[PDB]
Design a protein around this ligand. Structure first.
Ligand code: ZN
Lengths: 315, 317
């Protein structure tokens, strides 16, 4: 019947204590986290898992330390994929967005989890050593505002339009805070994402050459599981050299990715990213009555096990 | 580093003696042709190969008989694909146009060659038994003419725009001959294609019902090699039950297919269809300096072996 799309979100969807119910009550998930945590701890110096589940942090504290959040998103997503795999729920497509394209690539077979995690760690390290900090801002309003009132958003770059009432911009800290001030005087609602770098913008360009060089030391396979990419807006069969850089540097075309899938099939969408961000977007992008073709798992309601039971009816 | 696109043309690109040098000098090509020839001959009642290479028929004699040209195009294309694959030259994408979508699908694994050949044979037989004959005409001029002077093309259907100075229409013989007369009085150059049905138009609608029944009797696989279809102008992951009818009935979107591929990466394009028709189009659709990313193999210069050498240096490093 209709294919299962596993979707992976990127920077800005992470939060403290994400997936704690699975880390404690699901052996496949916990073992996968622990295995990757040992790899990551070597390169960072400390445990990622102990930062994700930091008992002094709440969900509402921004998890914006790039050395921890970059690997944390991948580890969370790949471990949940193992959970689904263990339960015999297999993807017909993977769909990555931002850093989620790494998890998509790893699940596809482009690289194994250990190498992908390494690529993510190096990117985080290189960005931290080379780039000024910055911010990413969600605008809870119409992207048409970018055309009618471009001055409102000066000194920022559009990184994503997610549906007809949600887009995201990226820029320097003070520039973004001034846009926020200006939006408030226009009654335009916005929300800072929990990141400390203007990802998907030219303000991480200082990291490019170092990361390009690092990528030349790696070898990747062709996709095995079909990939749909937010970076390209379509199916991805052949990957160029800079894909894993553009996964963090280029703007997203998530709506084009979903449109492409919906043109071919009536898919079921499973958001394997923290917060269920992509599932929320997809529900806005597909006919209302089709909202039960879409579900998420890891959300701050910490109901991952109930949600995995829901996923079983997609089988 | 640049992915390889194998392209397959359809009705209108065939000619007598296409591929004769491969047939005589290339064992893989010859054997593939003789194998399909035995399947095709069972349904048409005589060898396709002996018609293609009939010594009394010339490249300039239109090879427009559907019962022979339909299987001949597929046979030539699939046999050339076997030649390339035997040399280790593999497609990253296949691109089908008109009947060439059957070769694209077979190469992709949607069907085995023998079953796809059966579908082609059936389609040729049903169209011959159910449809009036017709013509297809290439206009060597701007498709803007269609909007500026629609009465010039009355009683014809637009089936393809191929580049800025090439588009193709289809319709009844007398209507097409009238259009040619009118075009000559306007100094608009045109060329009749070597086909005897108004493919890609409503004039082959009498065949749809029987062919769709036949198609329901078949079972097809999902693509294993990405297919970019001229039917949709994009990568095609599902083909519905009418796809192989639509491949010859619906207008084409070849420019859209090429723009789609070029938007993802700079490709190397190999035309596996007779005449090098698609290569010629692609050369007009991509920058002039980029012409060396495009080549053809089977052309009336009968230089297949030389062209296969050229293809060697298309190989991904
Ligand atoms: Zn595709």
């Amino acid at each position: 019947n209709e294919p299962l799309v596993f979707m992976f979100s990127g920077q800005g969807s992470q939060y403290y204590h994400m997936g704690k119910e699975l880390f404690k009550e699901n052996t496949v998930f916990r073992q996968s986290m622990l295995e990757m945590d040992a790899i990551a701890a070597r390169r960072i110096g400390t445990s990622i898992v102990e930062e994700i589940y930091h008992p002094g942090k709440r969900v509402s504290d921004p998890f914006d330390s790039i050395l921890f959040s970059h690997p944390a998103i991948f580890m969370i997503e790949y471990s949940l994929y193992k959970v689904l795999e263990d339960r015999g729920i297999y993807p017909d497509y993977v769909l990555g967005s931002s850093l989620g394209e790494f998890a998509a690539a790893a699940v596809s077979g482009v690289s194994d989890a250990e190498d992908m995690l390494d690529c993510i760690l190096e990117q985080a390290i290189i960005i931290q050593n080379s780039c000024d900090k910055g911010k990413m801002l969600a605008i809870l309003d119409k992207p048409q505002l970018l055309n009618d009132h471009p001055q409102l958003f000066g000194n920022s770059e559009l990184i994503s339009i997610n549906y007809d009432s949600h887009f995201v911009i990226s820029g320097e800290e003070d520039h973004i805070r001034k846009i926020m001030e200006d939006l408030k005087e226009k009654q335009i609602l916005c929300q800072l994402l929990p990141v400390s770098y203007a990802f998907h913008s030219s303000l991480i360009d200082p990291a490019e050459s170092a990361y390009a060089e690092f990528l030349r030391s790696k070898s990747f396979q062709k996709p095995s599981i079909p990939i749909v990419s937010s970076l390209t807006g379509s199916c991805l069969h052949v990957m160029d050299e800079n894909f894993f850089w553009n996964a963090v540097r280029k703007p997203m075309m998530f709506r084009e990715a979903i449109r492409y899938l919906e043109s071919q099939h009536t898919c079921k969408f499973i958001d394997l990213g923290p917060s269920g961000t992509l599932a929320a977007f997809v529900k806005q992008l597909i006919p209302g009555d089709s909202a039960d073709r879409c579900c998420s798992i890891i959300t701050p309601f910490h109901q991952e096990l109930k949600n995995l039971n829901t996923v079983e009816y997609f089988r």
